[PDB]
Amino acid sequence: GDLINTVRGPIPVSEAGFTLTHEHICGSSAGFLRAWPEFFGSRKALAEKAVRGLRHARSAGVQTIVDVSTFDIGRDVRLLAEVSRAADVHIVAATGLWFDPPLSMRMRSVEELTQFFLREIQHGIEDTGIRAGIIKVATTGKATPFQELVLKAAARASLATGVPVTTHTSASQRDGEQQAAIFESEGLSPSRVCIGHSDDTDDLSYLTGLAARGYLVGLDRMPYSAIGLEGNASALALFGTRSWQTRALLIKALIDRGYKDRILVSHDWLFGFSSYVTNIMDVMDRINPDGMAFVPLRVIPFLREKGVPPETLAGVTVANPARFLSPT
Ligand SMILES: [Co+2]
Ligand SMILES: [Co+2]
Ligand SMILES: [F-]
Numbered sequence: 001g002d003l004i005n006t007v008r009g010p011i012p013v014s015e016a017g018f019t020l021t022h023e024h025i026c027g028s029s030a031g032f033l034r035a036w037p038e039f040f041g042s043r044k045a046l047a048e049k050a051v052r053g054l055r056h057a058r059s060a061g062v063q064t065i066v067d068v069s070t071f072d073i074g075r076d077v078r079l080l081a082e083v084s085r086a087a088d089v090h091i092v093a094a095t096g097l098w099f100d101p102p103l104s105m106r107m108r109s110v111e112e113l114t115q116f117f118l119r120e121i122q123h124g125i126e127d128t129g130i131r132a133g134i135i136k137v138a139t140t141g142k143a144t145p146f147q148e149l150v151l152k153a154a155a156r157a158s159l160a161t162g163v164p165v166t167t168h169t170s171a172s173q174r175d176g177e178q179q180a181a182i183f184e185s186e187g188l189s190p191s192r193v194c195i196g197h198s199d200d201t202d203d204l205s206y207l208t209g210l211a212a213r214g215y216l217v218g219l220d221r222m223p224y225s226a227i228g229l230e231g232n233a234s235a236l237a238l239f240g241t242r243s244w245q246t247r248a249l250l251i252k253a254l255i256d257r258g259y260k261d262r263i264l265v266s267h268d269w270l271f272g273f274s275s276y277v278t279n280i281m282d283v284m285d286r287i288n289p290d291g292m293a294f295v296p297l298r299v300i301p302f303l304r305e306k307g308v309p310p311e312t313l314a315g316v317t318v319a320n321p322a323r324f325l326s327p328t
Pocket of ligand 2: 022023024068268
């Protein structure tokens, strides 16, 4: 009877089922959806699009997503609850800080940040009573001084609550190694940590080094590719030039090296996106019309056809998220 908190309340761990561990309803900024909803057409249009997309994922077998939007990604837990209910897909919300914190966060101490993360896990987000079930943190290269405090505060909040920590990295810069060192300096167990965007690199020395230490490896950008769009500089910079099959081969590469229990798979998809160039959501929807159904529709069959046993795929998509999310 282990439980996880969702935007609709507590659920049994065993009901999470097929879980995408790094997703977003909307990638935005604090206050932005409230102040400028017309950027997304309207709030109603954004919610309707998210409901359609989540229903499509559900039809393809997805039962839960972890929306890793923090305060500074503009997380709107009321929107999450509305779309979760309408689409019948569980959504786990996040606390933490990504790489766009405002001054009122950047000026805070490790102790103050710990209190904020604990508020969102133990009390509730804003005035809603909805509790976060994961802590999201970020570096983009070597940690800034402030990011070091964020990572330490995340470790402290995790140790106090059992909730896991998940990260954004610049994978080509091997950020996960420094992240791990900071977390371990606070006594955090690697089994509570997912080093994300790890499919942005093919450096298996880096990835197996983390997996060997007990970290979860987040292969979470499966549909990201600018192949065919190389003349679009903004798409090229965000999506890269590696195909989805190349990204998916990393799942098999880690399985083949003994690390099936250390893999989490996701898309890093969204239904609105205001923190990048205007039009980016349209580019993305053309790349991947299947949205959050892409992993079950394309990635899982690709792996099965390469010989990965169904039981292993179920372990990656069901058992690993359940172990990760269960407070421990
Ligand atoms: Co990220
Ligand atoms: Co993300
Ligand atoms: F992301």
